[model samples]
Target: SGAIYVGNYRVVNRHLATHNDWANLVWEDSSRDLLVSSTTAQGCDTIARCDCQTGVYYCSSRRKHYPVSFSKPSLIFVEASEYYPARYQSHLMLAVGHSEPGDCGGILRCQHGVVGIVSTGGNGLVGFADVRDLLWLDEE
Candidate 1:
């Protein structure tokens, strides 16, 4: 695969369809009510029927923000208008598989309304897998 420069970063997207021991978040268009009941030692919530769609406070992985069209058989460059996430500028992407049933598979954005390139386990591969920077980003 070839790499292209997007913004101030060079990017590449590799073919990863058949990688055993990995899971990917399947893309979906159908909208449904989600009950995100997160709990930790810090807080506790409830369990019941919930329906709310005030606004798209988060990004959906299964659905594209819009159909992105660019010239590329190898790679396309996407320069940012202002800022880029981690200076990666959509450079880092992976085809991963879910580990278990409860695994969220992948997240394009969370309730906080931000975009990222990390996993449900909060790990990223910038130059290599299990990089320390990714861990820090997750914890931060």
Candidate 2:
């Protein structure tokens, strides 16, 4: 029920998706959604859509159950909007994988205007759900 493929590399556990050599988790404030992409060290790239439904009495939004296509360096689209939302934007955030190899399998955040990497408490993958509140992007 929980599985996806990033090009030739198959991801058996959705939570473990960041283990690949290349990956990113982008967030959109308006919809409070995320888009995940991962590429093998050998360079097989793939992208998927994810929804943020962080167990709220209020609310939320993946591709496995949706239709999609593949392409070389499939993550090119990810770079299109590297910048974050306007300062006036609220609840907008971007969460991505570590730029270092040491934390390749983990996730980090730059919420609002703050930046951080590598989980201090535990493996980011293990605490991903709880870290959702801290995901954001910066223009710098």
Candidate 3:
């Protein structure tokens, strides 16, 4: 429905998947060095930057600014490769409460570091992919 600039690229909202049972949106781009997502269309304008030195994380949504807290970590496995012999990779799980279907690609920050991005959630819970498990991607 709109456009936003990330780094040097201007990304336009290309697709939206908001159903009565679920909600989410997709932007333009196939691959990049970094990625970002949120639950609402105005997220890019309302979301605040986390202060790493102070270990404080905050964001605004629906006209409310709230502080975020970290919960206990979990473990999960995901399909990493699917050619020939399939491969599964282990990812340290992170979660948050009050999750919505549109939160799937949102970021999860802890302390001064980023834990991961929202992957799935339901029943008042949401889980994410740990950045530690993705460090290998940088080595490529």
Candidate 4:
């Protein structure tokens, strides 16, 4: 179904380079797949892993069901990464509920570098990916 977590909170944005730790992932449904059934349980977003043939793709999270119907089910590890799972890596994220039009908005991950959103997120960054958008621990 269409469930949107419409709440409000103080947003934070950040800039990061390689060799850093990240903890989450956010992506739009693509042509290859659509977000049918999902669960934000335990802060870990996951889909049915039964698509990997005979339900081989298994992951952990709260209980949820699919709304849309598709013959082929597929699952991808969105937030649970090997190196950056849990709240360890501090993955970059974007908090839309706390955006003020270019302030506290979001950031971009480019191929070579990052395009920060000019907001009140310490360094004026935008975008809702929390890999580097968590606690600001500047090495100064």
Better of 3 and 4 by lDDT: 3
Q: Give the clashing pairs for model 2.
A: 51-61, 94-136, 110-136
**How would you encode candidate 3's per-residue C-alpha lDDT over 1-72 as one tens digit per residue?**
122322322222122222421222223121211232333222222122342211122221222222455443
Query: What lDDT tens digits, residue by residue, belong to model 2 across residues 1-140?
Result: 12223333332212233434224533212222222343343323222122332211100011111111111111111111213222222222223211222231232222221111121111211112122233221111
Question: Model 4, range 69-116, lDDT digits (tens) per residue?
Answer: 111212222232222232321222222222233322222223222222
Assess the local accuracy of residue 32 in candidate 3 as a C-alpha lDDT between 0 and 100: 15
Candidate with more favorable, higher lDDT: 2 or 3? 3
lDDT of 1 at 98: 21
Give the number of colliding residue pairs in candidate 3: 0
lDDT of 1 by residue, 1-140 (tens): 12222122211122211232023322111111011111122312111112111111111333323211111111222222111222232223222222111222222222332222222212221110111112222221
Off by over 4 Å in 1: 1-76, 79-91, 96-105, 108-132, 137-140
* Leading candidate by TM-score: 3
Tell me each candidate's TM-score.
0.16, 0.16, 0.39, 0.16
Q: Pairs clashing in candidate 1?
A: 22-97, 23-96, 23-97, 23-98, 24-96, 24-97, 27-62
- Give stretches of model 2 more than 4 Å off: 1-3, 8-23, 26-32, 41-140
Candidate 1 lDDT trough over 10 residues, lowest sum: 28-37
Query: What local lDDT score does residue 125 receive in model 2, on the 0 to 100 scale?
Result: 17
lDDT agreement with native, every candidate: 0.20, 0.23, 0.33, 0.22
